[PDB]
Amino acid sequence: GSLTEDGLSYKEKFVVRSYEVGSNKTATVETIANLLQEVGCNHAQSVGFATTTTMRKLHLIWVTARMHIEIYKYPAWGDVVEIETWCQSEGRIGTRRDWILKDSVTGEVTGRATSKWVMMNQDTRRLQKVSDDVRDEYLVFCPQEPRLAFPEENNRSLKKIPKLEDPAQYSMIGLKPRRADLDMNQHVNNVTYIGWVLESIPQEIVDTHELQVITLDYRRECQQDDVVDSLTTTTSNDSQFLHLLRLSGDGQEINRGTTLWRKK
Amino acid sequence: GSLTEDGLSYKEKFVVRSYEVGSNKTATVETIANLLQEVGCNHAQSVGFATTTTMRKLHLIWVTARMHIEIYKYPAWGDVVEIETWCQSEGRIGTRRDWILKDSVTGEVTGRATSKWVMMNQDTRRLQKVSDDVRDEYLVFCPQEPRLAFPEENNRSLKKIPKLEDPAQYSMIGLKPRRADLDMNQHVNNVTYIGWVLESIPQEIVDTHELQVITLDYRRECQQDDVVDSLTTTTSDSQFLHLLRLSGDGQEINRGTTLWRKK
Ligand SMILES: Clc1cccc2[nH]cnc12
Ligand SMILES: Clc1cccc2[nH]cnc12
């Protein structure tokens, strides 16, 4: 992978692996999400990081608040996908990382994603607005003119997500993370929550439809010793669902989301 | 990746990814196992396949009976690992696939693995000795002189594994596969069973030791709707005996052993 000529974005190519594909012999949305994470990490590494000198001193970290992915064509096993990523501040609220996925051969856009990140103290887990000293350290690595993966006016990435009310139409109960679900800091990988959301989609949908859009809000972290219930209700040729992940016991919310599926 | 000059083995390089590493910032044994599977698949693709024309007509498939992996150094995040793989028949019993892992920069061997595969009818799940017409179709893609990743006679890869007796010293119960654990044919990926075996190793061991050897026998498949219990007892460097079995009736799906060395 490499930073582009202007040094304000990063591009990397990936060959889709045999264990990365589903029943259609195309990459799953979890493989795509893992590739977005990888290109994000390689981008931070290329520019010197993803915490700054001031963030490490203050025990501050970036945490995902929302992930929004739209896939037009999932890459097939053996195909090469090219992914371009960049960051931009949104004032003191936080930062946005965007991605564009392309077919390496045709140059056609096959997907796009956006994520909203907030600053949080690693120890107290208390959120905070981005300081000016921290903001200044990041500004030189972001484009100054707005560059959005989702420029559209009434676009899906910014829609508010309601809370699913019991009884859910479908559920998957007792989901727990294993060591493979953890990252290098022993925290549950963000992509695991996407998998858990999709566990409560009925098999018939997975067999007849393809996942087009997924928007996920992250409210609370699942600890290594927590157990999760995944709930889904149909809200709708296109099927739409409302999703809720909550702790098995008291029902504390960890995530909420929506998916849009189109007939194959 | 590419077939080597003689066309009898296959080599491919991999850059270790951020989500592929554990707390030591080095690749997990499940990432290694996924990479072995990937290089095996690319090898079959490069030579025309993973079944032959005759196997497809008779509804026959290759299935793993045993996996044995030995890692000396796990590759760090961002490092390049080179893996070479080849196959060899073992008479009509089945076939063996071997692998050698190397540090791309130093050329030093960092790991090795061997697996034993048997032929099975995919519908009836009945085992079968290979035959002659099927054997002949494969022979031209294998070396003729023996080439073993574990040459030593009566080495760790060939040791018989006993059945763990209750009560187990440690256990992880209620393990179930999710869609990410399935392969392209909707069967549980073989690497998932490695993860499930390791779930019952105590955290203290994972924190103070590194996994050096893992041998796993595959007796029965976990179906998409099955629930598994992972059992472990210390038999000792630390060594453990492992058993995976269905949550209800306790039908055995896998047995194995691990060897761990102090960090
Ligand atoms: Cl990791 C990284 C690379 C470039 C720009 C960034 N802004 C916030 N984090 C960034
Ligand atoms: Cl897939 C594959 C490649 C080369 C040799 C083989 N023998 C059995 N299967 C093989």
Coordinates of C-alpha atoms and ligand atoms in Angstrom, one line a residue:
Chain A
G1 CA 0.0 0.0 0.0
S2 CA 1.0 3.7 -0.3
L3 CA 0.0 7.3 0.5
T4 CA -1.2 9.0 -2.7
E5 CA 0.9 11.8 -4.4
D6 CA -0.6 14.6 -2.3
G7 CA 0.1 12.6 0.9
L8 CA -3.6 13.1 2.1
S9 CA -5.1 9.7 1.4
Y10 CA -3.9 6.0 1.3
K11 CA -4.4 3.2 -1.2
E12 CA -3.9 -0.5 -0.9
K13 CA -4.8 -3.6 -3.1
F14 CA -6.0 -6.9 -1.6
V15 CA -6.4 -10.3 -3.3
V16 CA -9.7 -12.0 -1.9
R17 CA -8.8 -15.2 0.0
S18 CA -10.6 -18.6 -0.1
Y19 CA -11.6 -18.4 3.6
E20 CA -12.8 -14.8 3.2
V21 CA -15.8 -15.7 0.9
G22 CA -19.4 -16.9 1.6
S23 CA -21.8 -19.2 -0.3
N24 CA -21.8 -16.9 -3.4
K25 CA -17.9 -17.3 -3.7
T26 CA -17.7 -13.5 -3.0
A27 CA -16.2 -11.7 0.1
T28 CA -18.5 -11.4 3.1
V29 CA -19.3 -7.9 4.6
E30 CA -17.1 -9.0 7.6
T31 CA -14.1 -9.6 5.3
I32 CA -14.8 -6.1 3.7
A33 CA -14.9 -4.5 7.2
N34 CA -11.6 -6.3 8.2
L35 CA -10.0 -4.8 4.9
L36 CA -11.3 -1.3 5.8
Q37 CA -9.7 -1.7 9.3
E38 CA -6.4 -2.9 7.7
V39 CA -6.2 0.0 5.2
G40 CA -7.0 2.5 8.1
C41 CA -4.2 1.0 10.2
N42 CA -1.7 1.1 7.3
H43 CA -2.7 4.8 6.7
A44 CA -2.0 5.7 10.4
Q45 CA 1.4 3.9 10.2
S46 CA 2.4 5.6 7.0
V47 CA 2.0 9.0 8.5
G48 CA 3.8 8.4 11.8
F49 CA 1.2 6.9 14.2
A50 CA -3.5 6.1 15.7
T51 CA -2.9 8.4 18.7
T52 CA -0.8 11.6 18.7
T53 CA 2.0 12.6 21.2
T54 CA -0.6 14.6 23.2
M55 CA -3.2 11.8 23.2
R56 CA -0.8 9.2 24.6
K57 CA 0.2 11.7 27.4
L58 CA -3.4 12.2 28.3
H59 CA -4.4 8.5 28.0
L60 CA -6.9 9.4 25.1
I61 CA -7.9 7.1 22.3
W62 CA -10.2 7.2 19.2
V63 CA -13.3 5.1 19.5
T64 CA -15.9 4.3 16.7
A65 CA -19.4 5.8 17.3
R66 CA -20.9 4.8 13.9
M67 CA -20.0 2.6 10.8
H68 CA -21.9 2.8 7.5
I69 CA -21.0 0.5 4.6
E70 CA -22.7 0.3 1.1
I71 CA -21.6 -2.5 -1.3
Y72 CA -22.7 -2.6 -4.9
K73 CA -20.7 -5.7 -5.9
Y74 CA -18.8 -8.0 -3.5
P75 CA -15.4 -9.0 -4.9
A76 CA -15.1 -12.7 -5.9
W77 CA -12.5 -15.1 -4.6
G78 CA -9.2 -14.3 -6.3
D79 CA -10.3 -10.9 -7.5
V80 CA -8.2 -7.8 -6.6
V81 CA -10.0 -5.0 -4.7
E82 CA -8.4 -1.5 -4.4
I83 CA -9.3 0.6 -1.4
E84 CA -8.6 4.3 -0.8
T85 CA -9.1 5.9 2.6
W86 CA -8.8 9.4 4.1
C87 CA -9.7 11.3 7.4
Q88 CA -11.3 14.6 8.0
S89 CA -12.1 16.5 11.3
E90 CA -15.7 17.5 11.9
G91 CA -15.0 20.4 14.3
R92 CA -14.7 19.4 18.0
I93 CA -17.3 16.6 17.7
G94 CA -14.7 14.1 16.4
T95 CA -13.2 12.7 13.1
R96 CA -14.6 10.9 10.1
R97 CA -12.7 8.2 8.2
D98 CA -14.1 7.4 4.7
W99 CA -13.3 4.7 2.2
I100 CA -13.9 4.0 -1.5
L101 CA -13.7 0.4 -2.8
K102 CA -12.9 -0.3 -6.5
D103 CA -12.6 -3.2 -8.9
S104 CA -8.8 -3.0 -9.7
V105 CA -9.4 -4.2 -13.3
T106 CA -12.4 -2.0 -14.4
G107 CA -11.7 1.0 -12.1
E108 CA -15.4 1.0 -11.2
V109 CA -16.6 1.9 -7.6
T110 CA -17.9 -1.3 -6.1
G111 CA -18.5 0.1 -2.5
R112 CA -18.1 3.0 -0.1
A113 CA -18.0 3.4 3.7
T114 CA -17.9 6.1 6.3
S115 CA -17.2 6.0 10.1
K116 CA -17.5 8.6 12.9
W117 CA -14.9 8.5 15.7
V118 CA -15.0 10.2 19.1
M119 CA -12.2 10.9 21.6
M120 CA -12.4 9.0 24.9
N121 CA -10.1 8.6 28.0
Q122 CA -8.9 5.0 27.9
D123 CA -9.3 4.4 31.7
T124 CA -12.5 6.4 32.7
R125 CA -14.2 5.7 29.3
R126 CA -15.5 9.4 29.5
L127 CA -16.0 11.0 26.1
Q128 CA -14.8 14.6 25.3
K129 CA -14.8 17.2 22.5
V130 CA -11.5 17.2 20.6
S131 CA -9.0 19.8 22.0
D132 CA -7.4 22.4 19.7
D133 CA -3.8 21.2 20.5
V134 CA -4.8 17.6 19.5
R135 CA -6.8 18.9 16.5
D136 CA -3.7 20.8 15.2
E137 CA -1.5 17.7 15.3
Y138 CA -4.0 15.9 12.9
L139 CA -5.0 18.6 10.5
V140 CA -1.8 18.3 8.4
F141 CA -2.7 14.7 7.4
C142 CA -6.4 15.5 6.3
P143 CA -7.6 17.3 3.1
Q144 CA -8.8 20.9 3.9
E145 CA -11.6 21.0 1.2
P146 CA -14.5 18.6 2.2
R147 CA -14.1 15.1 0.6
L148 CA -17.1 12.8 1.4
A149 CA -17.7 9.2 0.4
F150 CA -21.4 10.0 0.9
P151 CA -21.9 13.5 -0.5
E152 CA -25.7 13.1 -1.2
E153 CA -28.2 15.4 0.7
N154 CA -30.7 12.9 2.3
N155 CA -28.0 10.2 2.6
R156 CA -28.4 7.0 4.6
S157 CA -25.1 7.5 6.6
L158 CA -26.6 10.2 8.8
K159 CA -30.1 8.8 9.6
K160 CA -31.1 8.4 13.3
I161 CA -31.6 4.8 14.4
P162 CA -34.6 3.9 16.7
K163 CA -34.6 1.4 19.5
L164 CA -36.1 -2.0 18.6
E165 CA -39.1 -2.8 20.9
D166 CA -39.8 -6.3 22.3
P167 CA -41.0 -8.7 21.1
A168 CA -38.3 -8.9 18.3
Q169 CA -39.4 -10.8 15.1
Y170 CA -36.1 -12.8 15.1
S171 CA -33.4 -13.4 17.7
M172 CA -30.0 -15.2 18.2
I173 CA -29.3 -15.8 21.9
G174 CA -26.1 -16.5 24.0
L175 CA -23.5 -15.1 21.5
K176 CA -20.0 -14.9 23.2
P177 CA -16.6 -13.8 21.9
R178 CA -13.7 -16.2 21.6
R179 CA -10.0 -15.3 21.5
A180 CA -10.1 -14.9 17.6
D181 CA -12.7 -12.1 18.2
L182 CA -10.2 -10.0 20.2
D183 CA -7.8 -7.4 18.8
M184 CA -4.1 -6.9 19.8
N185 CA -5.3 -4.9 23.0
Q186 CA -7.6 -7.8 24.1
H187 CA -10.8 -5.8 23.2
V188 CA -13.6 -7.3 21.1
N189 CA -12.9 -6.3 17.4
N190 CA -15.5 -4.0 16.0
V191 CA -16.2 -6.4 13.0
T192 CA -17.4 -9.0 15.5
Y193 CA -20.5 -6.8 16.3
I194 CA -21.3 -6.7 12.5
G195 CA -21.3 -10.6 12.6
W196 CA -23.4 -10.7 15.7
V197 CA -26.0 -8.3 14.2
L198 CA -26.2 -10.5 11.1
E199 CA -26.7 -13.7 13.2
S200 CA -30.4 -12.9 13.7
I201 CA -31.2 -12.4 9.9
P202 CA -33.3 -15.5 8.8
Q203 CA -31.4 -17.9 6.5
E204 CA -34.1 -17.5 3.7
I205 CA -33.1 -13.8 3.4
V206 CA -29.3 -14.7 3.2
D207 CA -30.2 -17.3 0.5
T208 CA -32.4 -15.0 -1.7
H209 CA -31.0 -11.5 -1.1
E210 CA -27.6 -9.7 -1.0
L211 CA -26.7 -7.2 1.8
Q212 CA -26.6 -3.7 0.2
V213 CA -26.4 -1.3 3.2
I214 CA -25.5 -1.7 6.9
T215 CA -25.4 1.2 9.4
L216 CA -24.3 0.4 13.0
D217 CA -24.1 2.6 16.1
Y218 CA -21.7 1.6 18.9
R219 CA -23.0 2.5 22.4
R220 CA -21.1 0.2 24.7
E221 CA -18.4 -2.4 24.5
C222 CA -19.0 -6.1 24.9
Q223 CA -16.4 -7.3 27.5
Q224 CA -14.4 -10.5 27.0
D225 CA -16.7 -12.1 29.7
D226 CA -20.1 -10.7 28.4
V227 CA -22.9 -12.7 26.6
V228 CA -25.0 -11.0 23.8
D229 CA -28.5 -11.4 22.3
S230 CA -28.9 -10.3 18.7
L231 CA -32.5 -9.1 17.8
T232 CA -34.0 -8.2 14.4
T233 CA -37.4 -7.0 13.1
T234 CA -38.4 -6.4 9.5
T235 CA -39.3 -2.7 8.9
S236 CA -40.2 -2.9 5.1
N237 CA -38.0 -6.1 -4.0
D238 CA -36.0 -4.6 -1.0
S239 CA -36.0 -5.9 2.6
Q240 CA -35.1 -3.6 5.5
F241 CA -34.4 -4.6 9.1
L242 CA -33.9 -2.9 12.5
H243 CA -31.3 -4.5 14.8
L244 CA -30.4 -4.4 18.4
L245 CA -27.5 -6.1 20.3
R246 CA -27.9 -6.2 24.1
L247 CA -26.3 -8.0 27.1
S248 CA -28.1 -11.4 27.8
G249 CA -28.9 -10.6 31.4
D250 CA -30.1 -7.1 32.2
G251 CA -30.6 -6.1 28.5
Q252 CA -28.1 -3.2 28.5
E253 CA -27.8 -2.0 24.8
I254 CA -24.4 -2.4 23.2
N255 CA -25.3 -1.6 19.5
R256 CA -28.2 -0.7 17.3
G257 CA -28.4 -0.8 13.5
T258 CA -30.2 -1.1 10.2
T259 CA -29.6 -3.3 7.1
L260 CA -31.0 -3.0 3.5
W261 CA -31.1 -6.1 1.3
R262 CA -31.9 -6.5 -2.4
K263 CA -33.2 -9.6 -4.2
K264 CA -30.5 -11.6 -6.0
Chain B
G1 CA 2.0 -17.0 -5.4
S2 CA 3.5 -19.5 -7.9
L3 CA 4.4 -23.1 -8.6
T4 CA 8.2 -23.6 -8.2
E5 CA 10.5 -24.4 -11.2
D6 CA 9.8 -28.2 -11.1
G7 CA 6.0 -27.6 -10.8
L8 CA 5.9 -30.0 -7.7
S9 CA 5.4 -27.4 -4.9
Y10 CA 3.9 -24.0 -4.5
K11 CA 5.1 -20.8 -2.8
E12 CA 3.3 -17.7 -1.6
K13 CA 4.2 -14.6 0.5
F14 CA 1.8 -13.0 3.0
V15 CA 2.0 -9.6 4.9
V16 CA 0.7 -10.2 8.4
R17 CA -2.4 -7.9 9.0
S18 CA -3.3 -5.8 12.1
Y19 CA -6.4 -7.9 12.8
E20 CA -4.5 -11.2 12.4
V21 CA -2.3 -10.7 15.5
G22 CA -2.7 -11.4 19.3
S23 CA -1.6 -9.5 22.4
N24 CA 2.2 -10.2 21.6
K25 CA 1.6 -8.3 18.2
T26 CA 2.5 -11.6 16.4
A27 CA 0.1 -13.7 14.2
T28 CA -2.2 -16.2 16.1
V29 CA -2.0 -19.9 15.4
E30 CA -5.5 -19.5 13.8
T31 CA -4.1 -16.8 11.4
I32 CA -1.2 -19.3 10.5
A33 CA -3.8 -22.1 9.9
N34 CA -5.9 -19.8 7.6
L35 CA -2.7 -19.0 5.6
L36 CA -1.9 -22.8 5.3
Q37 CA -5.4 -23.3 3.9
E38 CA -5.0 -20.4 1.5
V39 CA -1.7 -21.6 0.1
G40 CA -3.2 -25.1 -0.2
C41 CA -6.1 -23.7 -2.2
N42 CA -3.9 -21.6 -4.5
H43 CA -1.7 -24.7 -5.1
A44 CA -4.8 -26.8 -6.2
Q45 CA -6.0 -23.9 -8.5
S46 CA -2.5 -23.5 -10.1
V47 CA -2.6 -27.2 -11.2
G48 CA -6.1 -27.3 -12.6
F49 CA -8.3 -28.2 -9.6
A50 CA -10.2 -29.6 -4.8
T51 CA -11.2 -32.8 -6.7
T52 CA -10.2 -34.6 -9.9
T53 CA -12.6 -35.3 -12.8
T54 CA -13.2 -38.8 -11.5
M55 CA -13.8 -37.7 -7.9
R56 CA -16.5 -35.2 -9.0
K57 CA -18.4 -37.9 -11.0
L58 CA -18.3 -40.3 -8.0
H59 CA -19.3 -37.5 -5.5
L60 CA -15.9 -38.0 -3.6
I61 CA -14.1 -35.3 -1.6
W62 CA -10.9 -35.0 0.4
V63 CA -11.5 -34.5 4.2
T64 CA -8.8 -33.7 6.9
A65 CA -8.2 -36.6 9.4
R66 CA -5.2 -34.9 11.3
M67 CA -3.4 -31.5 11.4
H68 CA 0.0 -31.0 13.1
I69 CA 1.6 -27.5 13.4
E70 CA 5.0 -26.6 15.0
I71 CA 5.8 -22.8 15.2
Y72 CA 9.3 -21.6 16.3
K73 CA 8.6 -17.9 15.8
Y74 CA 5.2 -16.3 15.1
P75 CA 5.5 -13.5 12.5
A76 CA 5.0 -10.0 13.7
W77 CA 2.4 -7.5 12.4
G78 CA 3.7 -6.1 9.1
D79 CA 6.3 -8.9 8.6
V80 CA 6.3 -11.0 5.4
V81 CA 6.0 -14.8 5.8
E82 CA 6.8 -17.1 2.9
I83 CA 5.0 -20.5 2.8
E84 CA 5.9 -23.5 0.6
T85 CA 3.5 -26.5 0.3
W86 CA 3.4 -29.8 -1.5
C87 CA 1.3 -33.1 -1.5
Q88 CA 2.3 -36.7 -1.5
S89 CA 0.3 -40.0 -1.6
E90 CA 0.6 -42.5 1.3
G91 CA -0.5 -45.6 -0.7
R92 CA -4.2 -46.0 -0.7
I93 CA -4.7 -44.7 2.9
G94 CA -4.9 -41.1 1.7
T95 CA -2.7 -38.1 0.9
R96 CA -0.5 -35.8 3.0
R97 CA -0.1 -32.1 2.5
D98 CA 3.0 -30.5 4.1
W99 CA 4.1 -26.9 4.6
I100 CA 7.3 -25.0 5.5
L101 CA 7.0 -21.4 6.8
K102 CA 10.0 -19.0 6.5
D103 CA 11.0 -15.5 7.5
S104 CA 11.1 -13.8 4.0
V105 CA 14.0 -11.5 5.1
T106 CA 16.3 -14.0 6.8
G107 CA 15.3 -17.2 4.9
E108 CA 15.1 -19.0 8.3
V109 CA 12.4 -21.7 8.9
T110 CA 10.0 -20.3 11.4
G111 CA 7.4 -23.1 11.3
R112 CA 6.3 -26.4 9.7
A113 CA 3.0 -28.3 9.4
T114 CA 1.7 -31.6 8.1
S115 CA -1.9 -32.9 7.5
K116 CA -3.4 -36.3 6.6
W117 CA -6.4 -36.4 4.3
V118 CA -8.8 -39.2 3.5
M119 CA -11.3 -39.8 0.7
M120 CA -15.0 -39.6 1.5
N121 CA -18.3 -39.8 -0.3
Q122 CA -19.8 -36.3 0.3
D123 CA -23.4 -37.6 0.6
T124 CA -23.1 -40.8 2.7
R125 CA -19.9 -39.5 4.6
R126 CA -18.5 -43.1 4.2
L127 CA -14.6 -43.3 4.1
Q128 CA -12.9 -45.0 1.2
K129 CA -9.4 -46.1 0.3
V130 CA -8.2 -43.9 -2.7
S131 CA -8.1 -46.7 -5.5
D132 CA -5.9 -46.7 -8.7
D133 CA -7.6 -44.5 -11.3
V134 CA -7.9 -41.6 -8.7
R135 CA -4.3 -42.1 -7.5
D136 CA -3.0 -41.9 -11.1
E137 CA -4.7 -38.6 -11.8
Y138 CA -2.9 -37.0 -8.7
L139 CA 0.6 -38.6 -9.0
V140 CA 1.9 -36.2 -11.7
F141 CA 1.5 -33.2 -9.3
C142 CA 3.4 -34.8 -6.3
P143 CA 7.2 -35.4 -5.9
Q144 CA 8.1 -39.1 -6.3
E145 CA 11.0 -39.2 -3.8
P146 CA 9.7 -38.7 -0.2
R147 CA 9.7 -35.1 1.0
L148 CA 8.6 -34.7 4.6
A149 CA 8.1 -31.6 6.7
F150 CA 8.7 -33.9 9.7
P151 CA 11.3 -36.4 8.5
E152 CA 12.3 -37.8 12.0
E153 CA 10.9 -41.4 12.4
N154 CA 8.3 -41.6 15.2
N155 CA 8.1 -37.8 15.6
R156 CA 5.3 -35.7 17.3
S157 CA 3.1 -35.7 14.1
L158 CA 2.5 -39.5 14.3
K159 CA 1.8 -39.9 18.0
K160 CA -1.6 -41.6 18.9
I161 CA -3.9 -39.3 21.0
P162 CA -5.8 -40.7 24.0
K163 CA -9.3 -39.8 25.0
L164 CA -9.6 -37.3 27.9
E165 CA -11.5 -38.8 30.9
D166 CA -13.9 -36.8 33.0
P167 CA -13.6 -34.7 35.1
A168 CA -11.6 -32.3 32.8
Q169 CA -9.3 -29.9 34.6
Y170 CA -10.7 -26.9 32.5
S171 CA -13.7 -26.4 30.2
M172 CA -15.4 -23.9 27.9
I173 CA -19.0 -24.9 27.2
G174 CA -21.8 -23.8 24.9
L175 CA -19.5 -22.8 22.0
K176 CA -21.4 -22.4 18.7
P177 CA -20.4 -21.4 15.1
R178 CA -21.5 -18.1 13.6
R179 CA -21.7 -17.4 9.7
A180 CA -18.1 -16.2 9.8
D181 CA -17.0 -19.7 10.9
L182 CA -18.5 -21.3 7.8
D183 CA -16.6 -21.9 4.5
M184 CA -18.0 -21.3 0.9
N185 CA -19.9 -24.7 1.1
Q186 CA -21.6 -23.8 4.4
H187 CA -19.5 -26.3 6.4
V188 CA -17.6 -25.2 9.6
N189 CA -14.0 -24.1 8.7
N190 CA -11.4 -26.5 10.1
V191 CA -9.6 -23.6 11.7
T192 CA -12.7 -22.9 13.9
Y193 CA -12.0 -26.3 15.7
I194 CA -8.4 -25.1 16.6
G195 CA -9.9 -21.9 18.1
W196 CA -12.5 -24.0 20.1
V197 CA -9.7 -26.3 21.4
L198 CA -7.7 -23.3 22.6
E199 CA -10.8 -21.7 24.4
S200 CA -10.3 -24.0 27.4
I201 CA -6.6 -23.2 28.0
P202 CA -6.4 -21.0 31.1
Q203 CA -5.6 -17.3 30.6
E204 CA -2.5 -17.5 32.8
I205 CA -0.9 -20.0 30.3
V206 CA -1.7 -17.7 27.3
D207 CA -0.1 -14.8 29.2
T208 CA 3.1 -16.6 30.3
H209 CA 3.7 -19.1 27.5
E210 CA 3.7 -19.4 23.7
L211 CA 2.1 -22.2 21.8
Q212 CA 4.8 -24.3 20.2
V213 CA 3.0 -27.5 19.0
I214 CA -0.7 -28.4 18.3
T215 CA -1.8 -31.8 16.9
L216 CA -5.5 -32.3 16.2
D217 CA -7.6 -35.3 15.1
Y218 CA -10.9 -34.7 13.3
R219 CA -13.5 -37.4 14.0
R220 CA -16.8 -35.8 13.3
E221 CA -18.0 -32.5 11.9
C222 CA -19.8 -29.9 14.0
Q223 CA -23.0 -29.0 12.1
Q224 CA -24.1 -25.4 11.7
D225 CA -26.8 -26.1 14.4
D226 CA -24.6 -28.0 16.9
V227 CA -23.2 -26.8 20.3
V228 CA -19.7 -27.8 21.5
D229 CA -17.9 -28.2 24.9
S230 CA -14.1 -27.7 24.8
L231 CA -12.2 -29.7 27.6
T232 CA -8.6 -29.6 28.6
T233 CA -6.4 -31.4 31.2
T234 CA -2.7 -30.7 31.9
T235 CA -0.5 -33.8 31.2
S236 CA 2.9 -32.4 32.2
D237 CA 7.2 -26.8 29.2
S238 CA 3.4 -27.3 29.7
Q239 CA 1.5 -30.0 27.8
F240 CA -2.3 -30.5 27.6
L241 CA -4.8 -33.1 26.3
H242 CA -7.9 -31.7 24.6
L243 CA -11.3 -33.0 23.7
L244 CA -14.2 -31.3 21.8
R245 CA -17.6 -33.0 22.1
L246 CA -21.2 -32.1 21.4
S247 CA -22.9 -30.3 24.4
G248 CA -25.7 -32.8 24.8
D249 CA -24.9 -36.5 24.3
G250 CA -21.1 -35.9 24.4
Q251 CA -20.4 -37.3 21.0
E252 CA -16.6 -36.7 20.2
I253 CA -15.8 -34.3 17.3
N254 CA -12.1 -33.7 17.9
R255 CA -9.2 -34.7 20.2
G256 CA -5.8 -33.1 20.4
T257 CA -2.7 -32.1 22.3
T258 CA -0.8 -28.8 22.7
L259 CA 2.8 -28.1 23.9
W260 CA 3.6 -24.6 25.3
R261 CA 7.0 -23.1 26.2
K262 CA 7.6 -20.2 28.8
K263 CA 8.0 -16.8 27.2
Ligands
LIG1 CL1 -4.4 7.5 11.5 C1 -4.8 9.0 10.7 C2 -4.2 9.3 9.4 C3 -4.5 10.5 8.8 C4 -5.3 11.4 9.3 C5 -5.9 11.2 10.6 N1 -6.8 11.9 11.4 C6 -7.0 11.2 12.4 N2 -6.3 10.0 12.4 C7 -5.6 10.0 11.2
LIG2 CL1 -4.7 -29.8 -4.7 C1 -3.3 -30.8 -5.0 C2 -2.2 -30.2 -5.6 C3 -1.1 -31.0 -5.9 C4 -1.0 -32.3 -5.5 C5 -2.1 -32.9 -5.0 N1 -2.4 -34.2 -4.5 C6 -3.6 -34.2 -4.0 N2 -4.2 -33.0 -4.1 C7 -3.3 -32.1 -4.7

